[PDB]
From a paper:
Human 5′‐3′ exonuclease PLD3, a member of the phospholipase D family of enzymes, has been validated as a therapeutic target for treating Alzheimer's disease. We could not measure any phospholipase activity but the enzyme shows robust nuclease activity.
Here, we have determined the crystal structure of the luminal domain of the enzyme at 2.3 Å resolution, revealing a bilobal structure with a catalytic site located between the lobes. We then compared the structure with published crystal structures of other human PLD family members which revealed that a number of catalytic and lipid recognition residues, previously shown to be key for phospholipase activity, are not conserved or, are absent. This led us to test whether the enzyme is actually a phospholipase. Finally, we have mapped key single nucleotide polymorphisms onto the structure which reveals plausible reasons as to why they have an impact on Alzheimer's disease.
Author numbering: 72 to 97, 101 to 490
The structure:
């Protein structure tokens, strides 16, 4: 019936990037600190699933002092293969030709690197970001292999420490990326047993998490990349939504009930109707915190206003939407593709979901993504820490109702 429990002493830590100048009145380790500490303690293996690499000023054609943390991350990674650590890096194939200075330097250092052509395989991209260290620890979250991800962009991830069972489960997902990064690869009709898992929505892994029992599993996207035991990302996410009885707090960079960039536009109401059902059938309080910046897709506005219109005193329907805007001063505004909140996570009164994907259809049907799902009885824990980060952001001055003036938010914002 139920698969074997895990005996490892797992400890989870939420790790954040807080961009320079973003202040919150009255603390977690930073992505940069957590990463440097994962590298310093690596003795055998490092697997990185990645979207792109821009860790240096040279990569972005800037001269920013705040790129130093990214350049120190690259320097540490270059010491790993020479000292005997097996480094494997899966990266998304860019759509055109692009310079690959970081990956060259790591190849030169002895790391193995495979480009994955998800466009050929699924019409999507390899979007996931995660690290697996020594088959024991992993990072899963929103931060890219990008110096801007350490200092100029707001990020949210988790580091699971001392949790070899779950790290090995994550390595299985990595191994599918690693296989597909080979010449002549196609998606097998059936994935071999080597990739399958017992740990999923129906039977999550029983773990001991910061000293108390928890239920954890890893979900994966797109469906072609899921062996039969592997819960698909979208199914995991909708299960948290459908099980919520008091609130759903969602902080995601983009939300769009469409299959974004489809030449014939394609409506995609899967998550939308989940949130509508939750609030109308079960009286769930839904708070959606969507990021906004100069690159936001302007069609988001009408769909977000559609959701917000459901608030009704007498139906106990209570959806609220805010936009989170990272301010950019003059010098910051010259950094390409920065000053935005990249977080992607969901928390309810009983469950956590930490993902790598934005909430539009292609991320769940074509593009590679992963998410960690944890449930755990008892006040406190990982779940209350994530709720606290959400409420911090929701109540901060960086969060704005949809009627807010564009000239109040401290940055370009296409949704206002
Ligand atoms: C993960 O496991 C390591 C190794 O067991 C823990 O590190 C040790 O913690 C003990 C007791 O807390 C210390 O006395 C040692 O100095 C640590 N290093 C060793 C034993 O090599 C670590 O605390 C656990 N948690 C995390 C987040 O790393
Ligand atoms: C689970 O254990 C981890 C590891 O001890 C906790 O993370 C530490 O939290 C303190 C503050 O409480 C930080 O100053 C440390 O830097 C963190 N350690 C590491 C290795 O990052 C985490 O808070 C614990 N979570 C719960 C819910 O108890």
């Amino acid at each position: 019936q139920r698969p074997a429990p895990c005996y490892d002493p797992c400890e989870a830590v939420l790790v954040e990037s807080i961009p320079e100048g973003l202040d919150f009145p009255n603390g977690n380790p930073s992505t940069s600190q957590a990463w440097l500490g994962l590298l310093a303690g690596a003795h055998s293996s490092l697997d990185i699933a990645s979207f792109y690499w821009t860790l240096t000023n040279n990569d972005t054609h800037t001269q920013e002092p705040s790129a130093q943390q990214g350049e120190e991350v690259l320097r540490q990674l270059q010491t790993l293969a020479p000292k005997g650590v097996n480094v494997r890096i899966a990266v998304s194939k860019p759509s055109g030709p692009q310079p690959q200075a970081d990956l060259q330097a790591l190849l030169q250092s002895g790391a193995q690197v495979r480009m994955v052509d998800m466009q050929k395989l699924t019409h999507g991209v390899l979007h996931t970001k995660f690290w697996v260290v020594d088959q024991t620890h992993f990072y899963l979250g929103s931060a890219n292999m990008d110096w801007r991800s350490l200092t100029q962009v707001k990020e949210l991830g988790v580091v699971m420490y001392n949790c070899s069972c779950l790290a090995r489960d994550l390595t299985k997902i990595f191994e599918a990326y690693w296989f597909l990064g080979q010449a002549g690869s196609s998606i097998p009709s059936t994935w071999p047993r080597f990739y399958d898992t017992r740990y999923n929505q129906e039977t999550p892994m029983e773990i001991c998490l910061n000293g108390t029992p928890a239920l954890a599993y890893l979900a994966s996207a797109p469906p072609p990349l899921c062996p039969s035991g592997r819960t698909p990302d979208l199914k995991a996410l909708l299960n948290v939504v459908d099980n919520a009885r008091s609130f759903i707090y969602v902080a995601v960079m983009n939300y769009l009930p469409t299959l974004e960039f489809s030449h014939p536009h394609r409506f995609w109401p899967a998550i939308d109707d989940g949130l509508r059902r939750a609030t109308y059938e079960r009286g769930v309080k839904v708070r959606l915190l969507i990021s906004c910046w100069g690159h936001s897709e302007p069609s988001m506005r009408a769909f977000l206003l559609s959701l917000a219109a459901l608030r009704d005193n007498h139906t106990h329907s209570d959806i609220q939407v805010k936009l989170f805007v990272v301010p950019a001063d003059e010098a910051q505004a010259r950094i390409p593709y920065a000053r935005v909140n990249h977080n992607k996570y969901m928390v309810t009164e009983r469950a956590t979901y930490i993902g790598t994907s934005n909430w539009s259809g292609n991320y769940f049907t074509e593009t590679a993504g992963t998410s960690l799902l944890v449930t755990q009885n008892g006040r406190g824990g990982l779940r209350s820490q994530l709720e606290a980060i959400f409420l911090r952001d929701w109540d901060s001055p960086y969060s704005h109702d949809l009627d807010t003036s564009a000239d109040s938010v401290g940055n370009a914002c296409r949704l206002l």
